[PDB]
Amino acid sequence: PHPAEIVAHLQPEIWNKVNRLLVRKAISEYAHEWLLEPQRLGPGETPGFERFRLTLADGAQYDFDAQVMAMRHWRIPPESIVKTVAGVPAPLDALQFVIEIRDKLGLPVDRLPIYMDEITSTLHGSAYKHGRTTLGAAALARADYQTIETSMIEGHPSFVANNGRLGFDAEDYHGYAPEAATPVRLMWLAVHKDNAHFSCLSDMDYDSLMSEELGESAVTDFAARLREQGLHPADYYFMPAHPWQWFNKLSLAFAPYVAQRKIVCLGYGEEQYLAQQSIRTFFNISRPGKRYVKTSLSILNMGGLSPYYMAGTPAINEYIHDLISADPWLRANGFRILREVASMGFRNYYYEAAIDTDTPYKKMFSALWRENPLTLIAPGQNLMTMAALLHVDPQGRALLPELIQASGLDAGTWLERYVDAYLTPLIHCFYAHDLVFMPHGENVILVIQDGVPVRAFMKDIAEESSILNPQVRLPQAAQRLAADVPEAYKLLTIFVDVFEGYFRHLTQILVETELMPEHDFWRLVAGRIAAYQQAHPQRLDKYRRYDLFAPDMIHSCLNRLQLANAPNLPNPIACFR
């Protein structure tokens, strides 16, 4: 393999294209979070926009068109952005922009080059994604679950430096990046019960999980392998790992355990998987209806996987699932979690003895198995990550209109179906159960039926969910699920993760594609919320206490939070109270 081929995707014209796209996002999102305060100049190059200026690193100047939409959202046509340096035209360069605003960023000058490296890696991935052979909007909107999953481009829509994958070298990138869509086999390891522990749903056990996941031959073959090298299979579980994790972290940092045979490399599994958008979660493409496998993966990307939550994970999941199943409204709506049914943690007592506090060092060797949603839908239904609604192909065409065209519904009707499948159950979960998730594009999977959103699956459960009520009666293993939260913070999941985190980006698509005016979308959302409250009038106490129609709401600045690693925003639905 010629050593140049790993960066063949890095060419001048494509680099320039993705840089312009990222400068737009950086300007939009930093402005949104008050890191940038653009100065209005006059009317825009495009009619209906106004022109703004940023005057930066003593020389650098960026003029652009913007329309400032709800929640202080800067809608910026990428082609409108004009950089000059002391009166001279200069190409848009996203790394250079971040440098020009380094003082405004507030980065200790030793985390700065790290953040620069994340921007660069984000660009490098973006170049690859825009250059690769891929389906356009029309075709993608009609494509299967996994084709859609691996064809996503944007990543998290608010984080500028959202796609770092720092730790993957150039070859790792092509084997393991979700966007390379290269089948991956998991690494199987025998893990000593001195170090390893397993948890699962009450109706299952380790042996039945393995029977299902590996089969009798593979499991027999593993025990034999161990016994054949003089070891006692009775002392071990079998545990999957990301191959990168094995070569980069476990064979090395965990050398004492390998040396002492507390970890034994058994080799690659037979079945092939595709990396999901989360990178560390894998979908089995070899065989039907098998669970996802989520592994620990020590790369930097905005922020591994811990065994101390791997003790209580299935129990948290069993509780939430039984709760949702026993609720007649949720039953009727069809909203459902995908259970993390079994988890396993290898505990590194060296790191645990050295560090008493929370650390990524305790989270380097864990696995869980997650329910496969294909098994839970009907013929004539398909699945897609909710991130797909925000998708724009390399030609600049949005997926959403193509999906709505295929459904045969007007945008209003389609959007109502979507809101009641996605937003309404979250609101019910909060009002009825104080139960909250992390409801972003990557954690939500929509069940689609001939173009129409019918219902939603929620994933990423044990690590993201809370019951906002310390009095809730929880099984002993699930206790962490309960949380005691300031009043102002209870509705954050809607205000922060739904409205500002996801809907803010959706309406920009709605407006660019002329599917619906912004005011019409917020009115639609307010109406779905109001219709819910009317159908469940007995929780008026809670509707008034936690007012979704309050004039303003807490603004969490995601990038500023990543950079550290604001005043209230007006509520877009306030005027519909």
Ligand X SMILES: Nc1ncnc2c1ncn2[C@H]1O[C@H](CO)[C@@H](O)[C@H]1O
Instruction: Give the residues lining the site for ligand X (CB under 6 A).
Output: 155-156, 162, 277-279, 301-302, 387, 440-442
Give me the DSSP letters along 204-229.
Answer: --HHHHHHHHT-HHHHHHHHHHHHHT
- Binding residues with a second copy: total (CB under 8 A): 57
Please, which residue, 51 or 362, has the CB nearer to ligand X?
A: 362
Minimum distance from residue 166 beta carbon to a second copy (Å): 9
Could you tell me the CA-to-CA distances from 344 to 189, 232, 366, 446, 504 in Å, in that order?
12, 19, 6, 28, 37
Q: Which stretch binds a second copy (CB under 8 A): 259-267, 318-326, 366-374, 491-499?
A: 259-267
Pick from 69, 82, 85, 95: which binds a second copy (CB under 8 A)?
95
Residues 175-214 that bind a second copy (CB under 8 A): 187
CB 419 within 8 A of CB 528: yes
Mention every residue, 6+ apart, whose C-beta is less than 8 A from residue 212: 290, 291
Asked if 96 touches a second copy (CB under 8 A), the answer is yes
Asked if 120 touches a second copy (CB under 8 A), the answer is yes
What count of other Cβ atoms lies within 10 Å of the Cβ of residue 412? 14
Asked if 258 touches a second copy (CB under 8 A), the answer is yes
CA distance 541 to 361: 45
Residue 568 DSSP code = P
CA distance 491 to 495: 6
Minimum distance from residue 45 beta carbon to ligand X (Å): 30
Please, which residue, 129 or 290, has the CB nearer to ligand X?
A: 129
Residue 155 interface partner, choices a second copy, ligand X, none, CB cut-off 5-8 Å depending on type: ligand X
Pick from 86, 234, 332, 353: which binds a second copy (CB under 8 A)?
353
Please, which residue, 114 or 210, has the CB nearer to a second copy?
A: 114
Residue 258 interface partner, choices a second copy, ligand X, none, CB cut-off 5-8 Å depending on type: a second copy
CB 443 within 8 A of CB 465: no
Interaction mask 227-256, a second copy, x per CB under 8 A:
----------------x--xxx--xxx-xx
Give me the DSSP letters along 319-338.
Answer: HHHHHHHH-HHHHHH--EE-
Could you tell me the CA-to-CA distances from 320 to 199, 205, 266, 452, 575 in Å, in that order?
16, 19, 35, 27, 34
Please, which residue, 264 or 498, has the CB nearer to a second copy?
A: 264
Question: Among all chains, which residue has been given the structure tokens 């609101």?
Answer: 427
Q: Which stretch binds a second copy (CB under 8 A): 9-17, 290-298, 458-466, 467-475?
A: 9-17
Minimum distance from residue 302 beta carbon to ligand X (Å): 6
Asked if 26 touches a second copy (CB under 8 A), the answer is no
Asked if 90 touches a second copy (CB under 8 A), the answer is no
User: With helix as H, strand as E and coil as C, how does 495-525 read?
Assistant: HHHHHHHHHHHHHHHHHHCCCCCHHHHHHHH
What count of other Cβ atoms lies within 10 Å of the Cβ of residue 13? 7
Question: Among all chains, which residue has been given the structure tokens 């730790």?
Answer: 167
User: Beta strand pairing status for 366-370 and 236-241?
Assistant: unpaired
Give me the DSSP letters along 12-80.
Answer: HHHHHHHHHHHHHHHHHHHHHTTS---EEEEE-SSBTBEEEEEE-SSSEEEEEEEEEETTTEEE--GGG
Asked if 261 touches a second copy (CB under 8 A), the answer is yes
Q: Which stretch binds a second copy (CB under 8 A): 165-173, 283-291, 366-374, 550-558?
A: 165-173
Residue 90 interface partner, choices a second copy, ligand X, none, CB cut-off 5-8 Å depending on type: none
CB 163 within 8 A of CB 121: yes
Please, which residue, 186 or 398, has the CB nearer to a second copy?
A: 186
Minimum distance from residue 93 beta carbon to ligand X (Å): 23
CB 105 within 8 A of CB 563: yes
Residue 561 interface partner, choices ligand X, a second copy, none, CB cut-off 5-8 Å depending on type: none
Pick from 86, 88, 109, 234: which binds a second copy (CB under 8 A)?
109
Residues that bind a second copy (CB under 8 A): 2-4, 6-7, 10-12, 14-15, 93, 95-96, 99, 102, 109-110, 112-113, 116-117, 120-121, 123-124, 127, 169-171, 173, 187, 243, 246-248, 251-253, 255-256, 258-261, 264-268, 350-351, 353-355, 357, 359, 361
